[PDB]
Write a structure and sequence with these properties.
The structure is a homodimer. With 92 residues, the first copy, chain A, is α+β, with helices and mostly antiparallel strands. Helices cover 24% and strands 39% of the residues of chain A. The first copy, chain A, is globular and about 35 Å long. Chains A and B meet through strand 2, strand 3 and strand 5 of A and strand 4, helix 3, strand 6, helix 4 and helix 5 of B. Bound molecules: the ligand COc1cc2c(cc1OC)[C@@](C)(CC(=O)Nc1nccs1)NCC2. The ligand COc1cc2c(cc1OC)[C@@](C)(CC(=O)Nc1nccs1)NCC2 binds next to strand 15 of chain B.
């Protein structure tokens, strides 16, 4: 059910930083647990991950600094709605 | 003496922002500048990417000045709150902007205030998460104003410009022409709500506390609308997001922009509206706006769908194709609310679903459908009950190739009538026929167009341009339904 998305404008793309967006009614406790689960499953595969921020208030989820290789593993995690690769925004 | 931009937004009759607070998500700002001194609170929020001292504050100071400026501002002396999401080069991240928007909501939940206006004078590529964050912040009761973009492209391919809940603003000059930022320029299309002054805009300069600089861009344009909305919400604090959007469109200047600058196919989708403050005069009036759906494509099964706001009523539905190869349109109900669906025919590149979304409170609206009669009389359906008015006619045909309160269609096509029970509403049908590529019929002053359709010989389609019904062909008759408050 979970899908991956990245910016269509290739020079504006920021690989290595991902926004994991969870289901509409996912609670903050579940969001943090899903982030720690990702870190645990990624540590077993020999990959180092960093949870930069945990989202709550508007959308449930978290900001993770990890290798793209873990995306398939991350899309399989519970409560995951979609994952988006971070991208640049510019002053108009 | 008075800057050109502040005069354009001034209505033909006239006489803020204490009650309303305006959040700015741009670069760092010179809070000590005399133009914005004591009225801007720097949150000192920082989530900016690494740069690869006065040049940093340049973009944010000007915009804070365009919004709350004492001498050159739209909403003079308005309470402002700035969040830094863009670095010294005016560059940020989607993630940083998400944390920025979350902070505004967290601040709102901790210490609630009155109406809130969030100005996002930035743009990146289409972002699913950023558009979703903008949607949820709008659901919460926050007004979001964004820049269309300076890429001389369709605003729908940029974020937060394509978020349906936000107010996307394009830029125009003193000649009411679209701004040309060197090689590029202002963005356009169905995602743009309206335009606002965005060329040679004088505002606060970060160089010195009293200095002034002239700047151009969709950021400057969006800053005018953020200021206009802050004053509109100061006058009417009970305004919902659908209400404010309808007010901005209704009080805007019409047919002033020369469509020539925009690509042919985008000329129609792009709204010819230039932002303006409301006049002194404005009981209740009927507000309507034209919504254009995303191009359906080359799929016959996948159809173009035009939607309205949850507190907005769909009063009519029409369809368009530049080739004229379509299978009509339908007013189908979905999840308790009406949607406008457009069907595509064989050999047709695609179709547009054009809907008329109106603010109609204390009124009950329904759809009256009739399948093909296959007889000489033609497919007909009518609003039978008393106190009910016809607002729009839709017609779709599954075939490959071909009176008051009544919808008339083709014998091989289905017909859809929109009937509303509004006792304080007077509706009329205005028609115009010519034996020519374009036929127009317009509602008079004080009357709001609710329905636009073509009398059933080959037609490209029909669309509403403000209170004028436009029918495209290669006789041809344009049908307009004009309504008003009695
Ligand atoms: C991706 O599609 C759109 C995107 C956008 C807008 C409109 C869009 O489609 C019609 C408008 C013009 C606003 C608008 O009308 N909103 C609507 N909400 C629900 C139905 S219409 N500015 C923001 C971007």
């Amino acid at each position: 059910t979970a899908t991956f998305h990245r910016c269509a404008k290739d020079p504006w793309r920021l690989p290595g930083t991902y926004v994991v967006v969870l289901k509409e009614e996912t609670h903050l406790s579940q969001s943090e647990r899903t982030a720690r689960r990702l870190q645990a499953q990624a540590a077993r595969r020999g990959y180092l991950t960093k949870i930069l921020h945990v989202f709550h208030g508007l959308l449930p989820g978290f900001l993770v600094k990890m290798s793209g290789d873990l995306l398939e593993l991350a899309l399989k995690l519970p409560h995951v709605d979609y994952i988006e690769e971070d991208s640049s925004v510019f002053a108009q």
